[PDB]
Design a protein around this nucleic acid. Structure first.
Lengths: 205, 151, 100, 262, 30
RNA sequence: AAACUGCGAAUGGCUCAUUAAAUCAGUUAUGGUUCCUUUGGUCGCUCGUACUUGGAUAACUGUGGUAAUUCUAGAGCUAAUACAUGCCGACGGGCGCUGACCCCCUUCGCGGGGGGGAUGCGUGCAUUUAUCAGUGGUGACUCUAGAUAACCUCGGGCCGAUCGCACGCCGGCGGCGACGACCCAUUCGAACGUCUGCCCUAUCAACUUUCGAUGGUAGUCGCCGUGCCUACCAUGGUGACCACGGGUGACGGGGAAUCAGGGUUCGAUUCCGGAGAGGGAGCCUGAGAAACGGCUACCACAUCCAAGGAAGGCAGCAGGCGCGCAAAUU
């Protein structure tokens, strides 16, 4: 049962401070939600004012957004690969805000194939699995075909994202706080942010 | 320069830099608009804030700091901290029994946005009150006036 | 069925306490062997474990299946059983009434 | 202290209640409500100390629980209900209507109004905001929320509320040249025409006001309540028309009135 | 009540933008 | 009557031990937060048994244990505005994204357009994330409102299975209330910051420094801002304008005594703010307490005991002892 008061700290001058009262309830703190990756487990916390906090203890699934394509999907979280705060959080695979995680690319791949009529992350040696060449090709009239052709002019995906889609898992940043809202929402890493975090990950390992 | 000096990526949280743009439609860099706001009270946004590349979340102009409360002034005394300076406010306190004054001073740690390049020791700074930015910092430099002897 | 009892000092048996002796538990609302005096109150109370030994002042038993012959004063009497059902749906269920 | 306070010491009570010091230790702590604790007159003070309809708090309760007292057109049985500026108190049993209006001394006068005037009240709009899929909302000093206000109504304006239906029927803008009362500060209860508003960004705007007798004062913008368009009030004013006589003129008027009798 | 209030404010708002448009057109025209 | 349910018990009263920019006072700020209640608004805005659903448990009856308590244990019933579950209806559909198909015109280079469109997915408020566009507002938003792609916590959120009175109207439509639930304001606050101000002491001159010290970055936690805490990084921050340390028969203030002018001393004490409930510490419930006429433990003291255990907190009102120069009625 930790505290959060500012009067147990030394003053700006470095002098010692004398506590004039005992700990107050509103200065309380609670143990960290070391949100692991695993089958969902959330414990509701009663907080000041009678409201509720959702202390996520385990999360295997989040809501991640592909910002360039504006494609938000529910997705299994696979692993924790980088933490700017503490490397130990990577070793324990702790979900916190701004931690870099691997998410399944299947929902975004499915949306991309159903939107652009273009394969993504698909090996050239393979000739597609049954019952999905239809959604790729289908029987469309002239209007629908020209619509997809017009979409095809803006369907180019950067090489880093393409390689990730080949590997089957994307790099994402968790943008919510799992220990406060019970959710691991975030955004797929792209562009110079993706470059920076790939460089950091490869420098670490 | 090298904006990315920390372990985490540094960017303005309100600027989306990953928009898809075709290669042949490039004029300069692809896309990086710079977020800035004009703070009130007649203060002018520094040009370095508008055309800079620094990332400072405590900057009054390009950061997440709202200036409200007291507008004070001081002379820069120390600049040995990262994005923070110590200013000195001198004043006269009236002792009524002797009908006289005494010199007192208060040291105040204020956040210095990297938009104010070339800030010396001894020049006046106009600081504005914001939310607590750290243990001791509650003011942001809004204006810098050079010292009289500075050429 | 063994439905509880009181040890030689009167402390009642508690269902989950797998002990021969007596323990001290912090009891709150909902727990047996405790009645809160104010909302949110918890009290440290002595309770006897759920195992039946020879160190009991009284053991409570509930006859679940009746034997072959009546026990005088126990299984041969009758009960007025006041307070029939009060909620309407319970009345219908007891007397197999219909909506009409 | 833990949690909220429930008592009010008689000497810590607002001085404009004109409570004495020897009646008791406590003053009636106003209930939470439309008006602030220090800017209100509880129903018990009005029905006992001002109107003398009751001698004790028990008799105030006896009156209120017969549902004889309406505040802003609604029956109120809370004897500490906070009645504040512009509020209309209707006692239909005795057939009398009052509007809580400040005196030039800063006190709530016993100001009787006609039953036709008791149908409406002025309200200073505290804020305007858009919510609920583009629906504009207006909040007054009375703390009543009005949806779909006129698009011209802004903060610091005055609206007229029909108490039966509670919707805006007219409004005065906050303009120079409009009559206004002062609802706080040193000039509380004074009525005059707004002369000019000096704006201080990030601080308190100051409004200058000129009396009907030519006396000029100033208050903070938060203390200004527009009463009428031009110099014509939209409500009845007390016997003193918001003109604050100096103590010398008060003495002279009192002496003249006394010498006219006998 | 919701429907009536919405309709009344729609009419009043349309009239208010009509007034504002006419005033601004007069201002710019001269 | 009882008992269940709800609300209060966080106010008041007492005392001044702690406490030296701490408390407090004036001044501002919350655009950095929470807010029971009151008041006003919102509450068929959701396209997917209802003429009323389920199981308990009190009180009550009956059987008991212990020396002992505002201890409670079996058994037999029976309620809800307790606890749960849950639907006709508004409801006709609109909007968005899909897209088997058909018509008209221009060049039979359909480079183009305009439409109707059947199956399908999703829709309201709230939450979380990402993105876009610029209804109202501010000195100033990363504000308010809008749009899009989705999420939507088993510890799962709103969308009423409630109670009284008066009575009605050619199976339906109803008046006046009580109670309850989100949400947004309001009130009452609370919390945390700004600027300035505090006694004596140098026989206290240097202090602080990851036992976070000052700042940065990311997070955690928290109601929220913040070294509040953590991990990396920098080496800072305060001081003769008296830091740091020490003392205070130091709670601060409004104020009191005295006083030509100036001052000196006092302020435990009825108003405001703080703190505490023998000393520490930790919590439960709740909107609000680190509560003590709440709980848990240890330390000191202490009550009953059948020796197994059980029960404590007058700095509340009286009253007693002790202390003392020193202070009232159970």
């Amino acid at each position: 049962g930790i505290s959060r008061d500012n009067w147990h700290k030394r003053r700006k001058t470095g002098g010692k401070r004398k506590p004039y009262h005992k700990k107050r309830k509103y200065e309380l703190g609670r143990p960290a939600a070391n949100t692991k990756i695993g089958p969902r487990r959330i414990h509701t916390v009663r907080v000041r004012g009678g409201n509720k906090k959702y202390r996520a203890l385990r999360l295997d699934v989040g809501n991640f957004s592909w910002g360039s394509e504006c494609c938000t999907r529910k997705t299994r979280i696979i692993d924790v690969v980088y933490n700017a705060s503490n490397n130990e959080l990577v070793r324990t695979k702790t979900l916190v805000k701004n931690c870099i995680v691997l998410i399944d690319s299947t929902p975004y791949r499915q949306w991309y194939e159903s939107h652009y009529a273009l394969p993504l992350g698909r090996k050239k040696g393979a000739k597609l699995t049954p019952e999905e060449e239809e959604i790729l090709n289908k029987k469309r009239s002239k209007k629908i075909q020209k619509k997809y052709d017009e979409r095809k002019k803006n369907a180019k995906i950067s090489s880093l994202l393409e390689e990730q889609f080949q590997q089957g898992k994307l790099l994402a940043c968790i943008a919510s706080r799992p220990g406060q809202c019970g959710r691991a929402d975030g955004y797929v890493l792209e562009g110079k942010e993706l470059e920076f975090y790939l460089r950091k990950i490869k420098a670490r390992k | 320069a090298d904006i990315q000096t920390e372990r985490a990526y540094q960017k303005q949280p309100t600027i989306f830099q990953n928009k898809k743009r075709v290669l042949l439609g490039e004029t300069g860099k692809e896309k990086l608009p710079r977020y800035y706001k004009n703070i009130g009270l007649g203060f002018k946004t520094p040009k370095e804030a508008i055309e800079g590349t620094y990332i400072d979340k405590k900057c009054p102009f390009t950061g997440n700091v709202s200036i409200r409360g007291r507008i004070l002034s001081g002379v820069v005394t120390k600049m040995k901290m990262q994005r923070t300076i110590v200013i000195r406010r001198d004043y006269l306190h009236y002792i009524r029994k002797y009908n006289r004054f005494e010199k007192r001073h208060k040291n105040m740690s204020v956040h210095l946005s990297p938009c104010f390049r070339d800030v010396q020791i001894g020049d006046i700074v106009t600081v504005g009150e914001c939310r607590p930015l750290s243990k001791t910092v509650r003011f942001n430099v809004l204006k810098v006036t050079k010292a009289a002897g500075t050429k | 069925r063994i439905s509880g009892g009181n040890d030689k000092q009167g402390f009642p048996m508690k269902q989950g306490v797998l002990t021969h002796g007596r323990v001290r538990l912090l009891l709150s609302k909902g727990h047996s062997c405790y009645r809160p005096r104010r909302t949110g109150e918890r009290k440290r109370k002595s309770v006897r474990g759920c195992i039946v030994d020879a160190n009991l002042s009284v053991l409570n038993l509930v006859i679940v299946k009746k034997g072959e012959k009546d026990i005088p004063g126990l299984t041969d009497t009758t009960v007025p059983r006041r307070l029939g059902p009060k909620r309407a749906s319970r009345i219908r269920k007891l007397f197999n009434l219909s909506k009409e | 202290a833990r949690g909220p306070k429930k008592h009010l010491k008689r000497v810590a009570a607002p001085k404009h209640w004109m409570l004495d010091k020897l009646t008791g230790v406590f003053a009636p702590r106003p209930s939470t409500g439309p008006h602030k604790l220090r800017e209100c007159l509880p129903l018990i003070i009005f029905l006992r100390n001002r109107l003398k309809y009751a001698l004790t708090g028990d008799e105030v309760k006896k009156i209120c629980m017969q549902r004889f007292i309406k505040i802003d057109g609604k029956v109120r049985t809370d004897i500490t209900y906070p009645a504040g500026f512009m509020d209309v108190i209707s006692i239909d049993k005795t057939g009398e209507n009052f509007r809580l209006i400040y005196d030039t001394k800063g006190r709530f006068a016993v100001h009787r109004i006609t039953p036709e005037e008791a149908k409406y009240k002025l309200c200073k709009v505290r804020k305007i905001f858009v919510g609920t899929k583009g629906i504009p909302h207006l909040v007054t000093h009375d703390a009543r929320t009005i949806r779909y206000p006129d698009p011209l109504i802004k903060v610091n304006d005055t609206i007229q509320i029909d108490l039966e239906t509670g919707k805006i029927t007219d409004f005065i803008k906050f303009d120079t040249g409009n009559l206004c009362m002062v609802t706080g500060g040193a000039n509380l209860g004074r009525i005059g025409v707004i002369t000019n508003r000096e704006r201080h960004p990030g601080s308190f705007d100051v409004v200058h006001v000129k009396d009907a007798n030519g006396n000029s004062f100033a208050t903070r913008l938060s203390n200004i309540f527009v009463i009428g368009k031009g110099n014509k009030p939209w409500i009845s004013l007390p016997r003193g028309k918001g003109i604050r006589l100096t103590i010398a003129e008060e003495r002279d008027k009192r002496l003249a009135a006394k010498q006219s009798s006998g | 009540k919701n429907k009536e209030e919405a309709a009344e404010y729609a009419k009043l708002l349309a009239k208010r933008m009509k007034e504002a448009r006419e005033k601004r057109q007069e201002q710019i025209a001269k």
